From a paper:
The structures reveal a so far unique hydrophobic packing with a buried phenylalanine spine and thus define a new sub-class of LRR proteins. We now report the first structures, namely those of Crov588 and Crov537.
This core is flanked by a compact 15-residue N-terminal capping module. At the C-terminus, a unique domain swapping arrangement occurs where the last repeat(s) (261–290) of the first molecule extends across and caps another molecule to form a dimer. Dimerization is also evident in gelfiltration experiments. The restriction between prolines 13 and 20 and the inclusion of a bulky tryptophan residue gives rise to a reversal of the hydrophobic core packing at residues 17 and 18. Unlike Crov588, [name] lacks the histidine ladder derived from position 3 of the repeat as this residue is almost exclusively threonine. Residue 5 on the concave surface of the repeat is uncharged and either threonine at the N-terminus of the structure or isoleucine (Ile110, Ile134, Ile156, Ile180, Ile202) towards the C-terminal region, creating a hydrophobic patch at the center of the lower concave surface.
Residue numbers in the entry:
A (entry chain EEE), B (entry chain AAA): -1 to 290
Write the structure that this text describes.
């Protein structure tokens, strides 16, 4: 007897019962759900492309460990009674609604936004789940984080490589267990007055990031450090416990004061810049340049 | 009244008559055509992929202005009686036969080889039609041209950007009205003693081209000059007529001597190399560097 179900038609609603632990909705159209009786032992629920219906007054089974929202979903969620055992939550492309007053279940460990998520709302007043370990943002998120109470359970914080996030972070208070921080394309802010968590092992910067490292100090635990095409600042005071570094061919600074023991140095070959040609040009012709 | 036909089968030959001005031999048709009576006012003829049959003993109508050969066509043509009004001839990929005794009709203006044409035969003894204006070579053509009798009607000479053509050209007799010369990837020979035509407006060089321009004089008619990635020679005596120039980011020379009256200086960015960061790296760490 079957325990998985994909309700494509309106006919398939007669097919759901309490033996269904895996459910999929919204394959072909925005199926309304306000008056559906959910299976008592539902473990996974996936909302497909077309689904967009309010949920603030829908009681999902507390059995639900995994919930995925689809392309079209965009509704307020600050009023929702989340399942008690929800651990994994994924949000779709079109969802952009305030969550600053949401009541997370303390069982949530992973929160992921879609790669190109429209999500751009303030989060400085949020109460994170005490079990949150992984938080992944999308393309369009750009809000300050200097006054966010990160839970001590947080180990991984990731922005999409094409994130437009660019805010000051010098007054951020990181948790003591945060292992991985990954910034995106647009982040370029001073980091001299940042106290990184002593448990930090992986730190990744993006394209636009180019800041000085003369008054910076990194944790003794740092082992993986990557840089972007625009980073052209000297590296003298890197921690001697560093293991892997990554830089680009746009880097034109001396590397005599780098730590030993580095088991990998990755250089990323990028398309070269133009200054070395424009500088050796006649002044009256520098305005006549086309950069391809 | 249909005046257009595509022949795919032996049966379709019965659809031939004198009303057909546009004829196409189907992709799968590979049959002898020595005994075909061709439409009297045939204007355009196209052979598709699989056609490979002798044509020396075929008399195509004199009204045929546009003629095209397909992928598989590879047959001797030096004995062919070409139409009195042929203007546009195209050869396919697999065509590779001598053309030095061809007897072109004086109406031929345009001769094109397919992009990857295997055509590689000497042409120094050829008699060009007095109306040839545009001649385009393919990939594999590499034969001397210094002793070629070019017709004074030739305006455009092009090698494919991937051409393996690499021969001396310092003794070539360029026609007076030649206006566009484009060289391919592999051309790399001195041009110090080349007498460029006084009507030349466009000259393009390819990737491998790296020859000095100290003792070079270009016409006061030249407007467009292009160089490739390997070009790293100083440019101190370009004509004051030049309007557009193209270079790459691999150009490590000063350009203070560029002409005024330039309207556009195109700089193409290429993938940078790694040595400029390795030669400034701690000696004991250079071993473990990984290049991507």
């Amino acid at each position: 007897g079957s325990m998985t179900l994909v309700i494509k038609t309106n006919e398939d609603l007669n097919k759901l019962n309490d033996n269904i632990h895996t459910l999929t909705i919204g394959a072909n159209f925005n199926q309304p759900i306000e008056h559906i009786k959910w299976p008592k032992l539902l473990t996974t629920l996936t909302f497909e492309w077309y689904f967009d219906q309010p949920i603030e007054n829908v009681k999902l089974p507390d059995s639900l460990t995994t919930l995925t929202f689809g392309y079209s979903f965009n509704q307020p969620i600050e009023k929702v009674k989340w399942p008690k055992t929800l651990a994994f939550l994924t949000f779709g492309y079109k969802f952009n609604k305030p969550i600053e007053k949401v009541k997370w279940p303390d069982s949530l460990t992973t929160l992921i936004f879609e790669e190109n998520s429209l999500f751009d709302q303030s989060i400085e007043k949020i109460k994170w789940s005490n079990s949150l370990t992984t938080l992944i943002f999308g393309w369009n998120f750009n809000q300050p984080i200097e006054n966010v109470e990160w839970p001590e359970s947080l180990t991984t914080l990731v922005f999409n490589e094409d994130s437009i996030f660019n805010q000051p972070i010098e007054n951020v208070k990181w948790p003591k267990l945060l292992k991985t921080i990954i910034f995106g394309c647009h982040f370029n802010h001073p980091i001299e007055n940042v106290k990184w968590p002593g448990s930090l092992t992986t730190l990744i910067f993006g394209d636009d990031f180019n800041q000085p490292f003369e008054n910076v100090i990194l944790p003794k635990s740092l082992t993986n450090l990557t840089f972007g095409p625009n980073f052209n600042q000297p590296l003298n005071f890197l921690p001697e416990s560093l293991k892997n570094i990554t830089i680009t061919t746009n880097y034109q600074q001396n590397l005599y004061n780098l730590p030993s023991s580095l088991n990998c140095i990755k250089i990323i070959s990028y398309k070269r810049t133009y200054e070395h040609i424009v500088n050796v040009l006649p002044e009256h012709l520098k305005k006549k340049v086309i950069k391809i």
